[PDB]
Design a protein around this ligand. Structure first.
Ligand SMILES: CNCc1cccc(-c2ccsc2)c1
Length: 188
């Protein structure tokens, strides 16, 4: 009774078939997601503790930030397609929430250019159907679980992380609790 359904995690009443093993959702507009990623480094510490053969997937969502939110989901598709997530995640979060210099799709593009992604490369990707397919994949995944809040993490389409059942007096402890819970669920 150390881990229990309803505490560190909840159980999906409609389990999602064929879902990624560990699926994280976020928005660059999401203040708690900024904390999760830039301050707590949740994705990294979770990934760091996944069993061998367990892949981690991270998807952007549309339902925050209106038009720009949709642009960001497309830009994240570009980031995934090019494999430059580790290059643009920080400046995208800071551009939206710290400096608030990201106000348009062009501003988003500037972040990729500054990170060394060539203009032609970004634009071809941005306009590609491979990227359209990746946008659709992100939307479908979020749709599969009736997603309406971020940050969120799901394990095997069956369990949903519940950070509200964790102590926050110490950041590092919270993070390891979160990561050990994901590991526990992935072995479940
Ligand atoms: C959805 N936000 C979850 C959460 C739960 C507990 C602590 C935090 C936190 C602690 C320092 S920054 C953000 C976030």
């Amino acid at each position: 009774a150390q881990y229990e359904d309803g505490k560190q995690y909840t159980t999906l009443e409609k389990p999602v078939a064929g879902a990624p093993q560990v699926l994280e959702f976020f928005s660059f507009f999401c203040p708690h997601c900024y904390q999760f990623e830039e301050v707590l480094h949740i994705s990294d510490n979770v990934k760091k503790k996944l069993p061998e053969g367990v892949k981690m997937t991270k998807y952007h969502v549309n339902f925050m930030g209106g038009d720009l939110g949709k642009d960001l989901t497309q830009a994240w598709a570009v980031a995934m397609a090019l494999g430059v997530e580790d290059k643009v995640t920080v400046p995208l979060f800071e551009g939206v929430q710290k400096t608030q210099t990201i106000r348009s799709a062009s501003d988003i593009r500037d972040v990729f250019i500054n990170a060394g992604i060539k203009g032609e490369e970004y634009d071809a990707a941005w306009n590609s159907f491979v990227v359209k397919s990746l946008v659709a994949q992100q939307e479908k995944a979020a749709a599969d679980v009736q997603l309406r809040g971020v940050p969120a993490m799901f394990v095997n389409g069956k369990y949903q992380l519940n950070p509200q059942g964790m102590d926050t007096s110490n950041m590092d402890v919270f993070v390891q609790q979160y990561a050990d819970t994901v590991k526990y669920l992935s072995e479940k």
